[PDB]
Amino acid sequence: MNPIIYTTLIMTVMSGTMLVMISSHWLLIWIGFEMNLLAMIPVLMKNFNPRATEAATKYFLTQATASMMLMMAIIINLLYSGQWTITKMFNPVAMTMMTMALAMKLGLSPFHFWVPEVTQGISLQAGLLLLTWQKLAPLSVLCQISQSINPNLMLTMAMLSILIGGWGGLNQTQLRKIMAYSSIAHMGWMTAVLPYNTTMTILNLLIYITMTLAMFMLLIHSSATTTLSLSHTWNKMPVITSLMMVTLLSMGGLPPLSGFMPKWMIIQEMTKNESIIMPTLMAMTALLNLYFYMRLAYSSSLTMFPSTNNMKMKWQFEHTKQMKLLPTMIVLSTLVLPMTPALSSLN
Amino acid sequence: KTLLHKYSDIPEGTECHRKAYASTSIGGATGLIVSAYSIALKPPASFLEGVARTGRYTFTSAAIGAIFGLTSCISAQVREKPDDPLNYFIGGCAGGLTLGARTRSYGIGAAACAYMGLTAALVKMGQLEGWQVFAEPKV
Amino acid sequence: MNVLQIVRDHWVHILVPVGFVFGCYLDRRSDEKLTAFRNKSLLFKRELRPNEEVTWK
Amino acid sequence: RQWQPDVEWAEQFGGAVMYPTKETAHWKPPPWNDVDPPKDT
Amino acid sequence: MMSGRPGRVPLQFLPNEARSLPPPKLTDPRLVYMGFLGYCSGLIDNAIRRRPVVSAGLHRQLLYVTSFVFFGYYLLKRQDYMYALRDHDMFAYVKSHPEDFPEKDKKTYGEILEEFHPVR
Amino acid sequence: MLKIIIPTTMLLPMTWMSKHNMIWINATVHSLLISLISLSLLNQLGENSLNFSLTFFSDSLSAPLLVLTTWLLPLMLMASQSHLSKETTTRKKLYITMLILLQLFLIMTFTATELILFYILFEATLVPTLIIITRWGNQTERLNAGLYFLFYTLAGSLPLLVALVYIQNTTGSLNFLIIHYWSHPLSNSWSNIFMWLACIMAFMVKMPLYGLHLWLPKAHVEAPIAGSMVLAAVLLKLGGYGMMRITTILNPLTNYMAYPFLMLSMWGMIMTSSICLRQTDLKSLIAYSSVSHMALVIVAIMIQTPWSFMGATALMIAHGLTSSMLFCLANTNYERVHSRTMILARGLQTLLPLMATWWLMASLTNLALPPSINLIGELFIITASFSWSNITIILMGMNMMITALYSLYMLITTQRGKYTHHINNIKASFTRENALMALHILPLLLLTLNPKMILGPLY
Amino acid sequence: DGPEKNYEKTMAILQIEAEKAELRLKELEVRRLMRARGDGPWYQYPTIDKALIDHSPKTTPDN
Amino acid sequence: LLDLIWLETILPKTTSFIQMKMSIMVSNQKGLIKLYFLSFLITIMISMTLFNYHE
Amino acid sequence: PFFDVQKRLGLDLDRWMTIQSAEQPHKIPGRCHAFEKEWIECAHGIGGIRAE
Amino acid sequence: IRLQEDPDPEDENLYEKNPDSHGYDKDPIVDLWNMRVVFFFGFSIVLVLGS
């Protein structure tokens, strides 16, 4: 693509997301989702292989279906209230339609099937954008309409997301599919506390985006998309694999790392609401994510896999480009737990 | 919820036929849902193969429900203990044993006896003590 | 002899001692914000000696 | 010396999935460069 | 909770009523940890970029440190103001609703009968 | 506690900034200096605790544990520097960094005034421990050992996290002092029963309780020597210390909730002592013996008497020292014959006389020979159990008999008999190894002169 | 130092820890009441701003 | 019997086996748009029916 | 809005179409203008919880 | 060859080059000083003065 055209398409994706987050009118929110999808489709097809084309097609189908359901929910809400302002929904079935549409856009468990395939089918930069920036708009809408969501529907979808992200990621040797299933589990963690405290959702989203940015930038730095290709990285740049190991430990929520903060805060906020069984289930289920994170860490940094003879060529060469803000992303994703009370700034 | 309401409102250890019917209905409904998802995501090679898979899943789940209900209610009325989680534990283990019979495997049967019995005992405890699975927001 | 090498090589030997003194000083400051009951307990409180103004620090 | 993974250990993770069953026997690892060859013209 | 609070003007990191609280001290332990985070970021930047991690680019590590401390000071102010607001609203609500917060009648352990459980 | 914590933190910059060949010297010197400083925490008060700040405090329970940790670090360093001689400078510094991080986490864990802070610090110990085991262990089995240790601990710990935040929401505080002074009796209900289980199971799996112990043989066997030292000496004691702290909110529910655990540990001490009689791996035998002593500690904590708590404290200290000594003694033979099989190298007393003497001392302490503090702890727990129920004397006497049998059996098979004919590489004991055993054994015997220093706050 | 200092410092520690426990319970209660009743500064969810209503004379009189 | 076999079988081995089986059931998918959207129809219908959400 | 840029910058980006009692072209009235006006004037500034 | 791998090396005897080896370091001077600092700070200070 033309660098100017790619910059414009990226800016249009972000501007659709911003239109979603700054509008008080449902039509403009729908417009923002539309603009985001329109600009997003070409960045998925940037490399243009049949895998990229299929990933873009599946993404388009799911997002367009969700957008039509969202518009139908808006129209039912208007039919019963005459209201365009994004606020509590005045109709229950419109609320159900909207919740399902937003979950399908996010990729929650009953609508999760697109996330692994699309993430695998696109490049690591496209996947980084897909699993970080594309979560903002639906989650912001959900935080705005949280006072009218059905807690049972939302909590069901979140628990299923955690379970499926844990189980699906257990079987993966592809790094992009592992990232997608980790993303499903983390979206479940975000959406479980959404009925109770949207500040916890924002906190968890920020921590997850930091970890995902760090991990995807480490993968791009490594040029690895399979677990065996990553197993060669120690023999080229062991610093990258050790940083990746501490980041994976953070993703598993191991104290004293930054990834433990969202789980701990969400468990506390849930127990404040007489919710004890669900947090226990969620914390226990996250051990699956931690298991395949630990498998990746074993294959990458904690042990040394066989290398190749052609790796001696790569030793005499440096990186042409350097990932921006990667050291900051790594420090933020691992070391920020002592700063937890600053979460009140998100209030 | 009416499917669960009709099971819940009839007291424990009484009218064992009605409670068995309600648990059978819950089992059949759940098996129908799992059959729907299985048919959707792992389609058969023919309509009759799908009908057979649906009936197999549905009968397994309905038999688990009927067995759990019969054993739980009868052990409650026989011992005069309708608030004891032990009747629900016996029900869960009998459900695990009939699931093992349906899969015709002793290992699945034993593991399912343990797991489903403990689960049903926990459910009885949560009913008695007002535990919430989805707690409505308050604070 | 060779003072430059000795002070450029064994300078790390000051780190743990001075960390110990800094820990002692930080322990000192922690007590300064825990004096809401100095000379006020029902057990220990007493009148100050004529030039005395506090009972511990 | 310390045991380190060899080829037989590495190839547990080089498959299509992590737990090979019969329903994934036909699955192959995807292309190295993510591109599939063009079909019949 | 705090989204629809009255007077809460949009996109305002510190409101003007925050200037009534004491600003955080310069040697604040949290601010020093912010600076430490910046220093670790500089070290990791040297490591990833394949430079000597301790002695390469002292201006860059220094800038990491000062920018981290700069953001941390304002973050600390906003956090402290949010907690001050929380306490302010809690005390106002307890005051306006005395019936919800009764004055509990205090009793001594000499008149309170606590059950003794033997360990034996 | 900052006069202890900050010097330990300063070990990291000093380690990373020291010459490649001054690494072990510098770390050993300054960790011994920190251990000297930690001894001043043994000046305790009869009634109150040493409440330094809002976030750290010390009492007679945690001070001996802190001293044990700060003492273990230098011995670790002496044990490690042999098998890590061929490693790179950066990797040696990383190993030292892991050990320092573990010590710092343990120090803050034993002094944390708040329950959630204790939880985070006690969970933080997993990370350097897991790194040590899986990166610097010797066998392919270290990976599975790491997974077992990690997931056993976490399956225990997460329900504890839920219970702790629930307790904070209902009681208002997790502060240890507030928790003690505002103690409410725990009623008999399923809610409280499961709160008890959540509060107890993490420490149960950490000790470990018999039946939840299968991670320990793997982890203590596959780990490098320093890892085994810490895992046996200080990491097991986290469960006992935490159980002693948290049982103050579990009464009178502990009266009947402890019956399954009392039965499990009372019979599993017999079971694991019997397992030691047939272990063909020396390191595995030493690992399996930790389960029996920790079962005794479990019983002592579960019966909740002053004598039981005194015995449990003394037993934890004595077991830490003795188990680390035994692991080091096995490692010295492993570094010669490159195998953990016990009947591989026999008749070692006629080749390594002073090392055979060290072996005899270690076996005698594992025997709980009086007046060692091992015996003091075991006897106090036995007396408290006898008061709890007289029939406990059958099982505990059986256990001390079997313990004698397997300890002396290990001594006889490794040290006595005829040397192996084809093993011609048993070099003379280095000054470093003899000093390691001496620094294990001398403070153990000196504690007999002042036993109240390890008898806990109920003395 | 003398026993007095540890005694007094324990007293101050206990005082502020007890006040923090009390404040935490009170905050939880205030939160529950505010979320249930909507008469506090918290949980104020937006309603339409009434300055958006046009009160000008319309084309028809009955509106 | 106890340590190497049944204590292994009860907690860690059976749990690991269950997780592996669930992983196989969840992860192995045909990759077909058609089946995914049919399952979506099932989920949408269930949310508007017995799962009491729209009511 | 999640980020009320309009109320910070004083801009009316989409609030003009948000209700039918807002200003209309040629002052054409909404069919439920009085009803919406009364509900809005009741519910103004007391929060959604109270207004419900 | 099944892969290009180095053969397992033989363990080095600290006594072979240093009969006076204390077992701390292959270099005799740092080995001697490691022994000295270990013994002094452990026995002379922490054990005797600590006790």
Curated annotation (Swiss-Prot), chain A:
It is found in: Mitochondrion inner membrane. Core subunit of respiratory chain NADH dehydrogenase (Complex I) which is composed of 45 different subunits. Interacts with TMEM242. The chain crosses the membrane at residues 3-23, 25-45, 59-79, 89-109, 149-169, 178-198, 200-220, 237-257, 274-294, 325-345. Its EC number is 7.1.1.2. The lineage of its organism: Eukaryota, Metazoa, Chordata, Craniata, Vertebrata. Core subunit of the mitochondrial membrane respiratory chain NADH dehydrogenase (Complex I) which catalyzes electron transfer from NADH through the respiratory chain, using ubiquinone as an electron acceptor. Essential for the catalytic activity and assembly of complex I. This is NADH-ubiquinone oxidoreductase chain 2. InterPro entries: Complex_I_Subunit_2, NADH_DH_su2_C, NADH_UbQ_OxRdtase_chain2, ND/Mrp_TM. It comes from the Eukaryota. GO terms for cellular component: mitochondrial inner membrane; respiratory chain complex I. Belongs to the complex I subunit 2 family. Keywords: Electron transport, Membrane, Mitochondrion, Mitochondrion inner membrane, NAD, Respiratory chain, Translocase, Transmembrane, Transmembrane helix, Transport, Ubiquinone. It holds the Pfam family Proton_antipo_M. GO terms for molecular function: NADH dehydrogenase (ubiquinone) activity. It catalyses: a ubiquinone + NADH + 5 H(+)(in) = a ubiquinol + NAD(+) + 4 H(+)(out). GO terms for biological process: mitochondrial electron transport, NADH to ubiquinone; mitochondrial respiratory chain complex I assembly; reactive oxygen species metabolic process. The gene is MT-ND2. It is a multi-pass membrane protein.
Swiss-Prot record, chain F:
Its EC number is 7.1.1.2. InterPro entries: NADH4_N, NADH_Q_OxRdtase_chainM/4, NADH_UbQ_OxRdtase, ND/Mrp_TM. GO terms for biological process: aerobic respiration; electron transport coupled proton transport; mitochondrial electron transport, NADH to ubiquinone; mitochondrial respiratory chain complex I assembly. The keyword Flavoprotein does not apply. The chain crosses the membrane at residues 22-42, 60-80, 98-118, 147-167, 193-213, 224-244, 257-277, 284-303, 308-330, 351-371, 391-413, 435-455. It is a multi-pass membrane protein. GO terms for cellular component: mitochondrial inner membrane; respiratory chain complex I. Its main location: mitochondrion. It comes from the Eukaryota. Keywords: Electron transport, Membrane, Mitochondrion, Mitochondrion inner membrane, NAD, Respiratory chain, Translocase, Transmembrane, Transmembrane helix, Transport, Ubiquinone. Core subunit of the mitochondrial membrane respiratory chain NADH dehydrogenase (Complex I) which catalyzes electron transfer from NADH through the respiratory chain, using ubiquinone as an electron acceptor. Essential for the catalytic activity and assembly of complex I. NCBIfam families: NDH_I_M (TIGR01972). This is NADH-ubiquinone oxidoreductase chain 4. The gene is MT-ND4.
Swiss-Prot record, chain H:
Core subunit of the mitochondrial membrane respiratory chain NADH dehydrogenase (Complex I) which catalyzes electron transfer from NADH through the respiratory chain, using ubiquinone as an electron acceptor. Essential for the catalytic activity and assembly of complex I. It is found in: Mitochondrion inner membrane. The chain crosses the membrane at residues 31-51. Belongs to the complex I subunit 5 family. This is NADH-ubiquinone oxidoreductase chain 5. The gene is MT-ND5. Core subunit of respiratory chain NADH dehydrogenase (Complex I) which is composed of 45 different subunits.
